[PDB]
C-alpha cells in the first residue's frame, strides 16, 4: 500500500483543510475552514480504530451505540450513566429557546435511535413505546446478512426530511452501508457534516463499533470501516490545537474483545468489550 | 492526483487487479471493491466519459423526469426512451426527490404540495443559507422501498457552495461498472449544473461515492478493450437559456458540444 489509511489519513485529512480549507462563516456564528467530499479507509483486522493522537471517549461511544441501539432518545438515560455528550440538546434551556417548548427535558426528537429501529413510525416523545411501529432497519440488516449477504441493498438511512424538523439537530453521520465478502463484515458511513475537532474521532470508533457488534452477532470477521463525510471543517478557534496534534505520530491501534457470546442485538452491555492497548497522546 | 476520466478507468482496474469474487443478486458472478470516490471537475467541462459512448438524450430526459416527479415510464418512452422497461414503477426518485413522506397510491395520482419537496428545498436553501451543511437529497425510503421495482442506488446527495461555487456529492449504493456508472456520472453532473443555473452560481466538483463497485463476469473483456482505449477530453456543457424555473428545463436548452466518443 501506498495510499494512507488509519489515523494517517485523518491527519492527513485535517492537514489538507488546513492548507486548502475555505474560511465560510457557520451556523454557530464562530467560522470554520471547510473541504467538501473525502474519504478514508480504517482497516478492523485485528485492530480497533480509535484514534490515539488525542484521547478518544471510549465510554461513551459504547453507551451512545446502545442507547441507539434500543430506539432511545432520551438524553436522560445517558445522563444517568455519567455520558453528558447529549445534555445539552436535552436539558430545558436548548428546547426553549429552539422552539420545543412543549417537550420535557431530555426529548431529543427523532434522533438516529428512533430512525434506527421504527423508520416512518410517527413520534410522540421520548418516553413512549414504539415497538413494531415504523421500519427496523437495524435488524432487517442482521437478517440480510445471515439470509442473503450479497446483497447490496443493507443500508440504515437517519435522513427522514419528515421527521427532521422534530430533530434538536440533523443526523450528521445520515447513514451507512454494510457490505459482506469472505465472510468478512464492512461498513461505509456517510457523514454529511463531520467537525475533525470533536465529532469525527467520536463517529469513526461507533460505526467501528457498530461494525463489530453486527459482525459478532453474525458470526462474521470484521473487514473495514469506510469513512466518507461531506461538509469536512475545522473550526477556526481549534486550529491551534490541531496543528499541535499534527505533529504526533499516532500509535498502535487498540484491540477490541468481546468476552460474551451475545446472540442478541439489544443484549450487549458496556461489561462485554474489552478494550486493549489504548495509550493515547497526553493532552494539551 | 489523478483527474479526469483516468479516476474511473483506475477504478475499473483496480476491481480487475484486486476485485473480491461476490454474487450478483440475479446469480451470476461480479469482481468487486467496497468503498470508492472521485472527484470530477465541472469547471469549464463536464465528465461525460468518452472512452464509451453514453447516451446522453436519456441522461437528460430521465433527470427532467426526476424533476417533474414521474413514476411512470411510458413518459421516458413516449421519447423513444426504454431504459425503464404498466407505466407505474411504484415511489421512485421523482416521487422522493419532490414528494418525500407522501403517500404513494400509483404513477397518475397527484402528489403536488404532498410530501417534502427536497429538491426546491435545497434550491430556496442555496440562495438563504449557502453555508448550510444539510442541503440533501434522500432517495431512501425504507417506508416505500419495498413498493418501488427497482431500490435507489442512488442513495442520496449533498450540494456545498465554496467560491460561488456549486459541488454534489452523491453516494451511489451499488455501481455497475459496465453500464451505469458512466451514465449516473453525467446524471449528477448535469443535476450540478442545473441547479447551478437556477442559483446563478459557478459549477465546483462533482464527487462521486460508491459502495460496491463492481464488474458483472461478461463484461471484464468488454472492458479491458475500453480500458486500451486513450480518453479524451471531456465535452462542455452549455445552458443556452436562462431558466429561472426548476420544472422549466428542456432538452432544447441544452447545448453538448465537442464530445467525440470511441465507437
Ligand atoms: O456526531 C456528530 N459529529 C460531529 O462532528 N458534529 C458536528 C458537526 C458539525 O460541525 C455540527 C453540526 O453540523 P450542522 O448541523 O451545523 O451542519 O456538529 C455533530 C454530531
Ligand atoms: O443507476 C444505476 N447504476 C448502476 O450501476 N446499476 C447497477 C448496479 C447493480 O449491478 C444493479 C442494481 O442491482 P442491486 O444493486 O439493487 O442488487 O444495477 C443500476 C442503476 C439503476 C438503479 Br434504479
Same mark, same amino acid.
Given at each position: 500500500?501506498?495510499?494512507?489509511?488509519?489515523?494517517?489519513?485523518?491527519?492527513?485529512?485535517?492537514?489538507?483543510?488546513?492548507?486548502? @480549507?475555505?474560511?465560510?462563516?457557520?451556523?454557530?456564528?464562530?467560522? $470554520?475552514?471547510?473541504?467538501?467530499?473525502?474519504?478514508?479507509?480504517?482497516?478492523?483486522?485485528?485492530?480497533?480504530?480509535?484514534?490515539?493522537? !488525542?484521547? *478518544?471517549?471510549?465510554?461513551?461511544?459504547?453507551?451512545?451505540?446502545?442507547?441507539?441501539?434500543?430506539?432511545?432518545?432520551?438524553?436522560?438515560?445517558?445522563?444517568?450513566?455519567?455520558?453528558?455528550?447529549?445534555?445539552?440538546?436535552?436539558?430545558?434551556?436548548?428546547?426553549?429557546?429552539? =422552539?420545543?417548548? !412543549?417537550?420535557? $427535558? @431530555?426529548?431529543?426528537?427523532?434522533?438516529?435511535?428512533?430512525?434506527? #429501529?421504527?423508520?416512518?413510525?410517527?413520534?410522540?416523545?421520548?418516553?413512549?413505546?414504539?415497538?413494531?411501529? =415504523?421500519?427496523?432497519?437495524?435488524? $432487517?440488516?442482521?437478517?440480510?446478512?445471515?439470509?442473503?449477504?450479497?446483497?447490496?441493498?443493507?443500508?440504515?438511512?437517519?435522513?427522514?426530511?419528515?421527521?427532521?424538523?422534530?430533530?434538536?439537530?440533523?443526523?450528521?453521520? $445520515?447513514?451507512?452501508?454494510?457490505?459482506?465478502?469472505?465472510?468478512?463484515?464492512?461498513?461505509?458511513?456517510?457523514? #454529511?457534516? %463531520?467537525?475533525? %475537532?470533536?465529532? *469525527?474521532?467520536?463517529?469513526?470508533?461507533?460505526?467501528?463499533?457498530?461494525?463489530?457488534?453486527?459482525?459478532?452477532?453474525?458470526?462474521?470477521?470484521?473487514?473495514?470501516?469506510?469513512?466518507?463525510?461531506?461538509?469536512?471543517?475545522?473550526?477556526?478557534?481549534?486550529?491551534?490545537?490541531? !496543528?499541535?496534534?499534527?505533529?504526533?505520530?499516532? !500509535?498502535?491501534?487498540?484491540?477490541?474483545?468481546?468476552?460474551?457470546?451475545?446472540?442478541?442485538?439489544?443484549?450487549?452491555?458496556?461489561?462485554?468489550?474489552?478494550?486493549?492497548?489504548?495509550?493515547?497522546?497526553?493532552?494539551?
Amino acid at each position: 500500500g501506498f495510499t494512507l489509511t488509519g489515523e494517517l489519513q485523518y491527519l492527513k485529512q485535517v492537514d489538507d483543510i488546513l492548507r486548502y @480549507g475555505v474560511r465560510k462563516r457557520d451556523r454557530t456564528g464562530i467560522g $470554520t475552514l471547510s473541504l467538501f467530499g473525502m474519504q478514508a479507509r480504517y482497516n478492523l483486522r485485528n485492530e480497533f480504530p480509535l484514534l490515539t493522537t !488525542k484521547r *478518544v471517549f471510549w465510554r461513551a461511544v459504547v453507551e451512545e451505540l446502545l442507547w441507539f441501539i434500543r430506539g432511545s432518545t432520551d438524553s436522560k438515560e445517558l445522563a444517568a450513566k455519567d455520558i453528558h455528550i447529549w445534555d445539552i440538546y436535552g436539558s430545558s434551556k436548548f428546547l426553549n429557546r429552539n =422552539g420545543f417548548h !412543549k417537550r420535557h $427535558t @431530555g426529548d431529543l426528537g427523532p434522533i438516529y435511535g428512533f430512525q434506527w #429501529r421504527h423508520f416512518g413510525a410517527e413520534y410522540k416523545d421520548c418516553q413512549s413505546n414504539y415497538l413494531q411501529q =415504523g421500519i427496523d432497519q437495524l435488524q $432487517t440488516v442482521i437478517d440480510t446478512i445471515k439470509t442473503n449477504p450479497e446483497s447490496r441493498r443493507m443500508i440504515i438511512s437517519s435522513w427522514n426530511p419528515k421527521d427532521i424538523p422534530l430533530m434538536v439537530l440533523p443526523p450528521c453521520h $445520515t447513514l451507512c452501508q454494510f457490505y459482506v465478502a469472505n465472510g468478512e463484515l464492512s461498513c461505509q458511513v456517510y457523514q #454529511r457534516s %463531520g467537525d475533525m %475537532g470533536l465529532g *469525527v474521532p467520536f463517529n469513526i470508533a461507533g460505526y467501528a463499533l457498530l461494525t463489530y457488534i453486527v459482525a459478532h452477532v453474525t458470526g462474521l470477521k470484521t473487514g473495514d470501516l469506510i469513512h466518507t463525510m461531506g461538509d469536512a471543517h475545522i473550526y477556526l478557534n481549534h486550529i491551534d490545537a490541531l !496543528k499541535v496534534q499534527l505533529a504526533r505520530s499516532p !500509535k498502535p491501534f487498540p484491540c477490541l474483545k468481546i468476552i460474551r457470546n451475545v446472540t442478541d442485538i439489544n443484549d450487549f452491555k458496556w461489561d462485554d468489550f474489552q478494550l486493549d492497548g489504548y495509550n493515547p497522546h497526553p493532552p494539551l
